[PDB]
Symmetry: D2
């Protein structure tokens, strides 16, 4: 049996076979986890139901984390089949597209800031609030961050602030929920060509740069991220909580490799 | 003094205890000309009195919850200072019920929204509204706290909002550097100001810090004021995007209390 | 088969059943790795040979990392049975005991500094130099650090500087060896009652403090560290290099939990 | 100036390009009295000339490889300054063959030993030898580089030695804080001094930094000098154990060159 046997894990954020959440789901399934899936809106319904069935799952529930009621209804439905479960993968990041091009100070707005932080940071702890009493001891929560939290990256703009808020959220959630038996961590992934790359100019040349200066001399895949994610939601990682694990091939720890 | 010739807007003076009050005094002592904002009609009279005591006549209302308030303020400011040399952002707020008890239970969507809006977005909101008024060589400063970087009991959603604010420092420094503007923060140690109002065990916390801080005291608004004046002066020309810890070394020690 | 099948990993630093290296070895063995072991001096010979046999291993070699010749001879012997292999666990830390009590500036000496850095930092890259041509693509190197690298901890003294040197060593080794297919990481472990706790005053009260303020409300074990270590030397962690992973239950990411 | 009344020992002046030369000039300009050390007989005449130009007569040999040299120096210094207010450590060295090529191939046990001995241990060696001579309010300063925190090509074992040095800053600040002594570092951006001698592609590196640094220039010894003077002055009373980046914001940006 895999190292996720006996675990029930909810996975958010599967939008396509390219999604980081899809790679996480595949690895967790390979390691024996029973999975449940959410989807943002009705456009993704049929599609996520198909990915879920491939991964042994009947449990496919609508959840728009902009709305407290949607989160509450989704966990009420999940509780009909999983009265308790062992944690969830938060793989949800969003800012209005106009925020992510151009000079940051000119591009950012109060509303773009509000949405980026609400959807990409608040929603992680919103989900934890709503399922807190359903978690078993040994449970693990996981979210996905990016180096733009720690460094100023061109065009990433207000998403960098939202990810910095999210990484702090990881620490405060880990500190609050640890005593009752829940761990909370993040993977800071290197850039991956997913739907989150849509309309981001210079994304090809950006991946080429990472490929050149990353110590392992390739960019990471959703399979790399999936394997680390399965570890971090498994009991193998029982000694890790509140941690942001860089799964970017070492990109963040080198400088001036370009020359 | 080493701010002679600079014109610096100071937000956030609420009482003689305020961090911004200590910053303004230090900056005045080093020769800056100062302008002041006040949040609301409750605070106007105090800020006018303090401003007058530092030789300033420029006291303008600004509630950073409202874009129009920030715009109107900088329009008024431009009648007397068509250009100036930066501003001190000393504004932090979350609804008080956010700052008591288990973080996951206390946080709400609205408390989160407000904390991030008032404590983080307002810094770049201000920079947006005065960007064309900044001289080359200008400096912007904000105040952060160790709760950005570590989980501190009861600081709760303010820690996320400060983490957003420190990233804002980096993004703003990266964006405005090429125009000649630096952006930095001070991560101050705890100080008993109005920001301690209603906070559980604040005195026990200060006693802890005073015992484990390397300099064996907690910091004052004089200590923060002196570092702020440096970070807004041309002496710090080599420093941008930085969060400077002005906490007596508290953050760099561990298990000091065994 | 376990997630370390087809891997050959050399393990340094087993001194007793309490050693962090012993917990790492047990987990790697459980996950299907073939192991080889070193021992510092002849006092540990019989004992390490016994731990190794329990873990399926005939390969037990002397190695004192103070001496380049000892490291070279040991890898020449290892190459008779493992012409190539897949990485090693560096679990070796030492400073003269007088360095680790009292005010740091009064306790530290040039010689105590020299030894602490030589044995606890240089030896990691010494070992990599000496076996570089024996590593397969996919190989992984791992060392053990401690929070005293990042924070000033009473009495840890010059070992804090040596661990900071070691964590930088992790980054420079990862950057140099990544392109040929080798990853290099560290675990920063929370405190564990091992022989490395010998003669450290206040170690009981220190563990009690960690137990109280760690988010998971217990101190970590060599089994926690072993499971993370097996992950970091496995292909599951193919996207991680140059990283210092905190396996301390979240201790480092909280502050003022005491109150 | 803001160092009036302070007496500061400055190590590491080797040429007008040295970081320590810029520090000494800034400190003199702010009113400190200065004393100087020189490594060896080769450097004596230059350091005496520079010292005389800054009104100092206190020029003492000190090779931090030797405990007796440090002791003898502080014995000599105590004949004129029985107490003083801290020192600037601006000393970094690895054998040059360590600083070229693949790190794992270039590093050796002896090159490692020397880099850590001269660049890191010597800072606490100096503090040990003058500890009883430091006034309350004293400040110690050293110079680090981003290679402590990130793997930089060719910087090689100097990056480990700087990481050891920054931990030394923390441990020294923690140990000496309660006596009234602060200890900090400046992590300076690259500067073309004698420390660039023989270094591969140093000019290409500076061009890179000047393109991606937020302030769009590399830093000068004037920039570092001004920050050093602040960190050794009572204006920085709230700051100890800190590594202050004086690199124009270079370290806080990423992928700026796309
Ligand atoms: N792709 C990268 O380069 C990269 C690198 C590091 C981190 N990340 C982060 O990884 C996570 C997954 O992104 P991805 O790259 O897999 O792209 P993706 O577009 O496939 O996944 C993003 C998902 O967020 C979901 N989502 C957005 N708003 C939502 C809402 N209101 N309610 C519910 N769900 C909502 C979307 O439906 C989608 O399933 C994001 O947080 C992203 O910021 C991406
Ligand atoms: N006191 C500490 O321990 C401490 C330590 C580190 C950082 N900080 C931060 O320093 C800053 C100044 O806090 P303080 O300790 O001086 O307390 P304070 O209460 O004196 O000052 C906070 C100021 O924020 C202003 N403000 C709040 N909401 C506003 C709004 N919508 N528009 C305009 N102004 C608004 C208030 O009027 C007040 O002037 C805050 O950002 C605080 O988070 C405080
Ligand atoms: N025990 C803790 O609290 C803790 C926490 C974090 C990190 N660490 C680090 O974990 C690693 C393992 O320590 P441990 O706690 O398992 O204690 P241990 O005493 O069981 O292991 C230390 C090992 O280092 C070996 N060693 C020392 N000098 C050597 C030399 N010259 N040549 C070859 N080997 C030598 C010793 O023989 C011993 O096997 C060390 O690096 C330690 O600093 C320990
Ligand atoms: N130039 C840069 O790009 C840069 C950037 C950041 C930090 N640094 C660091 O700043 C410091 C000053 O370097 P610099 O750029 O001014 O170059 P420099 O060559 O002018 O100064 C280095 C000084 O170290 C002294 N020194 C070397 N070995 C010594 C010994 N055994 N005893 C006494 N003194 C010894 C030398 O005599 C010289 O005065 C070094 O620590 C350097 O690592 C340099
Ligand atoms: C790398 C990198 C990424 C990927 N990544 C780490 C993310 O977190 C991407 C979040 C992201 C959030 N909101 C978005 C979009 C993307 C665009 C699609 C559409 N969904 C949209 O309207 N809004 O995005 C970048 C943006 C600018 C610069 C660099 C990057
Ligand atoms: C230290 C420390 C501080 C001071 N400090 C760093 C801050 O940033 C304090 C921001 C803060 C924001 N909003 C607040 C208040 C304070 C309380 C008064 C009233 N103004 C209120 O309703 N809302 O506050 C803490 C709160 C909990 C635990 C520790 C601390
Ligand atoms: C925690 C903690 C540890 C454990 N730990 C993380 C280590 O890395 C311990 C390394 C260590 C190195 N050298 C030592 C010894 C230990 C003592 C046994 C004997 N082997 C000796 O002569 N020299 O040690 C501490 C020392 C002081 C304060 C706190 C701690
Ligand atoms: C930047 C940068 C620097 C400058 N700098 C931050 C330093 O700390 C430079 C220390 C340094 C230590 N020892 C040295 C030398 C220099 C060379 C001259 C001679 N003095 C020598 O034999 N030994 O050096 C680099 C070396 C490689 C790559 C990048 C850099």
């Amino acid at each position: 049996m895999g190292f996720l046997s006996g675990k029930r894990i909810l996975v958010t954020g599967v939008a396509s076979k390219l999604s980081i959440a899809y790679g996480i789901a595949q690895a967790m399934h390979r390691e024996g986890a029973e999975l449940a899936f959410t989807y943002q809106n009705d456009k993704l319904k049929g599609r996520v139901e198909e990915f879920a069935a491939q991964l042994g799952s009947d449990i496919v529930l609508q959840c728009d984390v902009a709305e407290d009621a949607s989160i509450d209804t989704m966990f009420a439905e999940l509780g009909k089949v999983w009265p308790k479960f062992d944690g969830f993968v938060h793989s949800i990041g969003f800012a209005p597209g106009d925020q992510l091009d151009g000079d940051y100070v000119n591009a950012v707005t109060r509303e773009g800031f509000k949405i980026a932080h609400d959807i990409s940071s608040y929603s992680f702890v919103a989900m934890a609030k709503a399922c807190r009493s359903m978690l078993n001891p040994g449970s693990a929560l996981l979210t996905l961050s990016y180096l733009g939290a720690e460094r100023a990256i061109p065009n990433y703009n207000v998403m960098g602030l939202a990810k910095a808020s999210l990484e702090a959220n990881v620490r405060y959630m880990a500190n609050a929920m640890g005593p009752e038996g829940v761990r909370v961590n993040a993977i800071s992934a290197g850039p991956i060509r997913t739907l989150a790359a849509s309309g981001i100019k210079d994304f090809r040349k950006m991946l080429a740069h990472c490929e050149a200066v990353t110590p392992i001399r390739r960019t990471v895949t959703i399979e790399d991220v999936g394997n680390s994610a399965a570890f971090l939601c498994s009991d193998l990682s029982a000694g890790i909580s509140g941690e942001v694990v860089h799964v970017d091939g070492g990109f963040s720890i080198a400088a001036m490799n370009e020359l």
